[PDB]
Amino acid sequence: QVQLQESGGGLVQAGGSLRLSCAVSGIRVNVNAMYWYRQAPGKQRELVAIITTFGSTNYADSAKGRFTISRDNTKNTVYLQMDNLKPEDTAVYYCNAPQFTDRYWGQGTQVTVSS
Amino acid sequence: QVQLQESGGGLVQAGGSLRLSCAVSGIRVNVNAMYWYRQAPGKQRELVAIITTFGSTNYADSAKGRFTISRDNTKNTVYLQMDNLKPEDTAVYYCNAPQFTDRYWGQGTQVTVSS
Amino acid sequence: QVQLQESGGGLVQAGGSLRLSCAVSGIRVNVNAMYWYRQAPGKQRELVAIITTFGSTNYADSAKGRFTISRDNTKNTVYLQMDNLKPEDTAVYYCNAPQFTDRYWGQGTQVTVSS
Amino acid sequence: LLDKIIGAVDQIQLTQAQLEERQAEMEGAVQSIQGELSKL
Amino acid sequence: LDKIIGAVDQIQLTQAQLEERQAEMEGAVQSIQGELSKL
Amino acid sequence: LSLLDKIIGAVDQIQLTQAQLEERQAEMEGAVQSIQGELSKL
């Protein structure tokens, strides 16, 4: 199976920073493009950031230069650095590969941002 | 042109098995991802199974472990093994490559499953 | 940034021909698939022609054998030859790469065809 | 490097088939709405 | 290398077709949205 | 510019394009569900 273990969330003040981790098993992150998503309560899942196999990145407009996706190939782990957080970023954050979004989701990591 | 010659259909009892063949000319099946589709009377064409260039497979939920797609690279032929067939599998079955589905379809091979 | 500088439009008689050019900077046309689009007044942008990284081409049905997309790798320029033009081809023509169509469009080149 | 390219290609082909399936599902839904808005 | 190239080529052709389908359908949805929003 | 460099750049373009096509689908799937809800309400 593919395993997705999201971590690094918590309660953070506005203007604060987080670094999310997703430890992956069953696929290689240096072979596969990897995506981060978020889901606020009662809203649709939103794509946040992507990193391609060869390391190109793109971000949703809501990220607007605050988020940085990266990976560690040895730890087979994907990271999302999130700076200058705002209350509107409160959501559960999920990591996935595009080929499995119809198939499996991890538990996500809760991020709550308060003023 | 690309030629698609579907065969191996027929009349089969429920719980029976079939092996469909598509003999391809004009593209190499070991270079191109190849798809099987089916169409029951008056319904939309449904994707059934796919095999990628490097041999990974995926199936529609309706296949649920009963179908196996494979190929022979020398005969340039794609196969669909169908086990534990059910009346609901009655349809015309078609093989195609994704880049030509807007362009050409073969005659398909009729599969009829009776109880 | 990516720069897209479209040229080669003008006023042409029906049955006439044009050759559009798009000079690209910031990406290589021999590495990226490149697209030509057109937009008539008040209508949706229509894809016209595509050339893949390895030189395969495809055309919208409205081209019907009249248009030829090509590129010069040394000049990093994409061309659209348009033969037997018709009044219905009047539009602004734009070149882009698929990964930037959500991001940036050049000024385009106006093509007007009169009888 | 070749393993990376191959695995990228494989991921991509799997994703393209799923995106196609999603489009086909949605094309039926839009046609159903269009039939609802067009009926007599 | 011939296999990789041919896979890539198939993929780029397919992406352009999937995009065209999206644009056609996006127009259809926008037409429906306009029908449901008019006065 | 080697053949491998071309392949890598094509792949990179493709993965970027796939994520955008997916996002467009998600945006439109929300729009269709909103229309479906409007036509299904009591």
Author numbering:
A (entry chain F), B (entry chain D), C (entry chain B): 2 to 116
D (entry chain E): 59 to 98
E (entry chain C): 60 to 98
F (entry chain A): 57 to 98
What does the primary publication say about this deposited structure?
The cavin HR1 domains form a highly extended trimeric coiled-coil assembly and provide a core structure thought to mediate intermolecular interactions of cavins promoting homo- and hetero-oligomerisation. A positively charged basic surface towards the C-terminus of the HR1 domain interacts preferentially with plasma membrane-enriched phosphatidylinositol 4,5-bisphosphate for lipid-dependent recruitment of cavins to caveolar membranes and membrane-remodelling activity. Using the mouse Cavin1 (mC1) HR1 complex, we immunised alpacas and subsequently isolated two high-affinity nanobodies, NbA12 and NbB7, that specifically target this Cavin1 coiled-coil domain.
However, at the centre of the HR1 domain in Cavin1 are a conserved pair of histidine and threonine residues (His102 and Thr105 in mC1) that form a buried hydrogen-bond interaction. Interestingly, however, although both structures were obtained in different space groups to the wild-type protein, they still showed a lack of density for the C-terminal region of the mC1-HR1 domain beyond Lys97. The binding affinity (Kd) of NbB7 for the mC1-HR1(HT/II) mutant was moderately enhanced from 520 to 142 nM, whereas its interaction with the mC1-HR1(TS/DD) mutant was improved by ∼8-fold with a Kd of 66.7 nM. Surprisingly, both mutant proteins could be purified similarly to the wild-type mC1-HR1 trimer and they did not display dramatic differences in stability when we examined their melting temperatures by differential scanning fluorimetry. Similar to the wild-type Cavin1 protein, confocal microscopy showed that Cavin1(HT/II)–GFP and Cavin1(TS/DD)–GFP both localised to typical punctate caveola structures at the plasma membrane, indicating that the mutations do not prevent the ability of Cavin1 to form caveolae (with membrane-embedded CAV1). Intriguingly, however, although Cavin1(HT/II)–GFP could stably recruit both Cavin2–mCherry and Cavin3–mCherry to caveola puncta when co-expressed, the phosphomimic TS/DD mutant of Cavin1 recruited Cavin3–mCherry but not Cavin2-mCherry, which remained dispersed in the cytosol.
